[PDB]
Amino acid sequence: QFLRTDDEVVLQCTATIHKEQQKLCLAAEGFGNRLCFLESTSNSKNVPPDLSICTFVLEQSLSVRALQEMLANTVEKSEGQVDVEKWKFMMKTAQGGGHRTLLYGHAILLRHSYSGMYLCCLSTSRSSTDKLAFDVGLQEDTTGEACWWTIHPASKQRSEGEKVRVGDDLILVSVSSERYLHLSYGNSSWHVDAAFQQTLWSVAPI
Numbered sequence: 001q002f003l004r005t006d007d008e009v010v011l012q013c014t015a016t017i018h019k020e021q022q023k024l025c026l027a028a029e030g031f032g033n034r035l036c037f038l039e040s041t042s043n044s045k046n047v048p049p050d051l052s053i054c055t056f057v058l059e060q061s062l063s064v065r066a067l068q069e070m071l072a073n074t075v076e077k078s079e080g081q082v083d084v085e086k087w088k089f090m091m092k093t094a095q096g097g098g099h100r101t102l103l104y105g106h107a108i109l110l111r112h113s114y115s116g117m118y119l120c121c122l123s124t125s126r127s128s129t130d131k132l133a134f135d136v137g138l139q140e141d142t143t144g145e146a147c148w149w150t151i152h153p154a155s156k157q158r159s160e161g162e163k164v165r166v167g168d169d170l171i172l173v174s175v176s177s178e179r180y181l182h183l184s185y186g187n188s189s190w191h192v193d194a195a196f197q198q199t200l201w202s203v204a205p206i
Helices: 064-073 087-096
Strands: 008-017 020-027 037-040 056-063 106-112 118-122 134-139 148-153 169-174 180-185 190-195 201-205
Touching: 008 180, 056 064, 064 106
Parallel strands: none
Antiparallel strands: 008 020, 008 056, 008 201, 020 037, 037 190, 056 106, 106 118, 106 148, 118 134, 134 190, 148 169, 169 180, 169 201, 180 190
């Protein structure tokens, strides 16, 4: 069982505090500040109350090198058109791409299924003046690295380049801010932000 692109998934994280443990799924909405948050699951009494907001699609999965190269070529260059026909070349590139397995170390593109937007590492902290963690929300455009998250192995069992299994605890890192998709304990609830601290994420096809 491997994670494939275009696969509909939900990102979860185990949150423990006050001798109490629970699971939360990365949720979001296309309205408002489109800021991401977390939903409590199976609390009464199975899975997140609103799974829709915790629904994501593994749109893309490129190597950091390839991704940065692609973005670099889109800065100032007349060449670099994948669709020259453009239609035919587009059909070939689409059918040639994938439909591809996720590899550890690869930068992925998560599209919030509901809002149709993409998980993004916003440059706004809105948590402190120390610029500790940034905000993680939704973005319409994918141009850049903010909407890209490199997946990393939780334990020493998984290695870079290895196939990502369904159920593998992934560590997401914002390509733009090099910050992890961290789990934060605000006021009295759980939130999600891009911090310099890891957080194991359970990406399951759902």
